[PDB]
Structure 1
């Protein structure tokens, strides 16, 4: 199953907030894992365990005594989580789900001197490369791009624009490359 990182219990018009964040950083598969837990009061991170540091540390004065407590009680089992949570989730849960999720992008050229819009929508993962071509040649001047837009539903979208000279008999093409494709998508226009 999937595993969660433990929020460790500390010792003993207005609103108050506490936040526990457990963050697993994977680099090159599982060759390098970095575990970071954060304890946040309102918007203030006062206490942090960081696998690279190897123990809990107070971030603010507010966590002065919390660091020592969490080091006596929780140090050993927090370190072990890098393995029983981080590595276990990646290798046993992400690999056969998220890391396999491939959503092919939808490409749609539209018109709005003028402006050609290349809409690239509903793709996953995030890596993608979109280019404009005129006469087999790559356009560079007059290409604007949005930043990669995350939709929140596990797809992304991106919009690439080209200012052009509408000469009749000129053919503009939007070229799209993405890990989901065995061949790049090309879509043409007038």
Structure 2
């Protein structure tokens, strides 16, 4: 199937409290595999996945040096933006970037990413044509003009179509099967109620990976999406995820409801109902 290599970058100023905090986090198929955190005595790029430990010392050295270079460049960008926005030197500000490539099964780029945000709002982004830019405001228009003159889009298309795809292949060779990892959910239904003629049935999905999952409740073939309560998928903290969906039903009709669990690790969707313990 398709794969992706993307870096999530963060630069946060802290006037009076020290140098800006800079971070570079790499993801292969939405899984963190490397991280650089400037908040240290001697900051270094590090593996976040055991399979990256294969890379030799020269790799880590080049990545570390490039990261510190990026950090210092962003330090300047933070100042530049205070200027573009006519802002004070005393407030904290954040610059964020999502930069990467998602390639198809045939090894060709499906989509390139080079998008920026300032204080949580879109700043500028490279368009799908990998040739033009979309500035979100007046400030971004200055960067746009500057990048157009420098041929920045061409520079990024090169990286996105070449360098990024090539590195993704390399990383996949060392952690392909690992990324293919799949933990199917284990489900069960709990019964809850406060002295009333109604009861809550909560369908739980535990220990699954990846996070993508769907839970539904059915009353005789029909999905109850109107009054079904559910929580956002959440990390158990051990690499797997959790999620639940609940519905309020009439006391005594618990057996008329069925929960369905859809996950990529399941040979077939799970089907279950409330089971009063023996």
More strand by share: 1
User: Relative to structure 1, is the Cα distance of residues 158 and 40 closer, same or farther in structure 2, using a 3 angstrom cutoff?
Assistant: closer
d(CA) in 1 for partners of 2:257, 2:121: 52
Q: Which moved more, 1:80-89 or 1:92-101?
A: 92-101
User: Relative to structure 1, is the Cα distance of residues 139 and 38 closer, same or farther in structure 2, using a 3 angstrom cutoff?
Assistant: closer
TM-score normalised by length of structure 1: 0.67
5+ residue gaps, structure 2: 9-65, 81-88, 193-197
| 1:17 aligns to 2:93 (yes or no) | yes
Q: Which of 216, 228, 237 is equivalent to 1:144?
A: 228
8 Å CA contact 2:260–2:271 kept in 1: the answer is yes
Which residue does the alignment assign to 2:157?
A: 79
Which residue does the alignment assign to 1:101?
A: 181
Q: Which of 213, 230, 236 is equivalent to 1:128?
A: 213
The 5 Å alignment of 1:24-103 reads 24=100, 26=102, 29=105, 33-43=110-120, 45-52=122-129, 54-71=131-148, 72=150, 74-88=152-166, 90-93=168-171, 96=176, 99-103=179-183
5+ residue gaps, structure 1: none
The 5 Å alignment of 1:105-120 reads 105-112=185-192, 113-120=198-205
Question: How far apart are residue 21 of structure 1 and its match?
Answer: 0.8
8 Å CA contact 1:21–1:39 kept in 2: the answer is yes
Question: How far apart are residue 80 of structure 1 and its match?
Answer: 1.0
- Paired residues in the alignment total 187
d(CA) in 2 for partners of 1:108, 1:100: 26
d(CA) in 1 for partners of 2:121, 2:135: 11
DSSP-derived class of the 1:125 partner: coil
Which residue does the alignment assign to 2:31?
A: none
8 Å CA contact 1:34–1:50 kept in 2: the answer is no
Cα deviations by residue, 1:26-64 (Å, 9 ceiling, x for unpaired): 486566522232344444544433342513454322233
DSSP-derived class of the 1:96 partner: helix
